[model samples]
Target chain A: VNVQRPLDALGNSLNSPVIIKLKGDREFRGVLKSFDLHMNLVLNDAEELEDGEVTRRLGTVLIRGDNIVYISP
Target chain B: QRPLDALGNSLNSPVIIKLKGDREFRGVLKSFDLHMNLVLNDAEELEDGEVTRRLGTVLIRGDNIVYISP
Candidate 1:
């Protein structure tokens, strides 16, 4: 098993496809573009998810720090 | 994908900021720091699809930020 700092986990996930869960129970999937120490995020080729289904394309987006609940690769 | 870089490019651009408690602020982006702390010009509070309060200039703490759409 491999464990890493919370930030490190994000580092490894960079440039890969990621799924983000926001506080509003909203979901998004996209190429992990960039992230800041504050958990601020940029995503490319984003698609909104509802019930694990793609609902719409969001293109590039700026997701603020406090909006996020989880980031998964 | 340096995220902060995008935010920097958004300077002086129109943006809508959302936070917890179903609150939103609309204005032109001025500046922001690593913590997502934000400054806006010609800012105003948004509610029910309308402006609720007119705030000329404001600084919002990063902790309350939900998303910033430019």
Candidate 2:
């Protein structure tokens, strides 16, 4: 159940576009700027997606760590 | 394996835990279980960088934890 590898994977993927799934079935795609241990993330050029379509554009958004399920590069 | 390893590596370090309800906790990591349940010592509620409450020796349910920081 060690989580460090994936966290390191994330760090290596910085500045790359990623898809993040959150709690409540919400999803976002954007370039990863930064992330902390709590999984709180900063994304640039962020956009919320609904049913695979862009719904809203959110620039420089801070995602609460608690809401995130997974992040994919 | 990843989550457990992450927690294992973080023992005895300072961790910031953010719960699902937007409440944050800061404390020294005492221990954790396979379920991600936590034991924290000298715990305190963090509100916008201010201490809101002192929660000495707290046990946190794994389901309530959103993330634990390094």
Interface RMSD list for the candidates: 2.1, 8.7
Q: Cα lDDT for residue A20, model 2?
A: 93
* Candidates' C-alpha lDDT: 0.83, 0.76
Best by DockQ: 1
lDDT of 2 by residue, B1-70 (tens): 1335556666888777767766889898899876568899999998777989998789998778755556
> Pick by lDDT: which candidate is best?
1
Question: What's model 2's lDDT at B1?
Answer: 16
lDDT of 2 by residue, A8-60 (tens): 86787789999999886668898987777767677778887878888767665
Q: How accurate locally is residue B19 in candidate 1, as Cα lDDT from 0 to 100? A: 75
CAPRI level of candidate 2: incorrect
Candidate 2: fraction of native contacts reproduced: 0.03
Candidate 2 segments exceeding 4 Å error: A1-17, A24-70
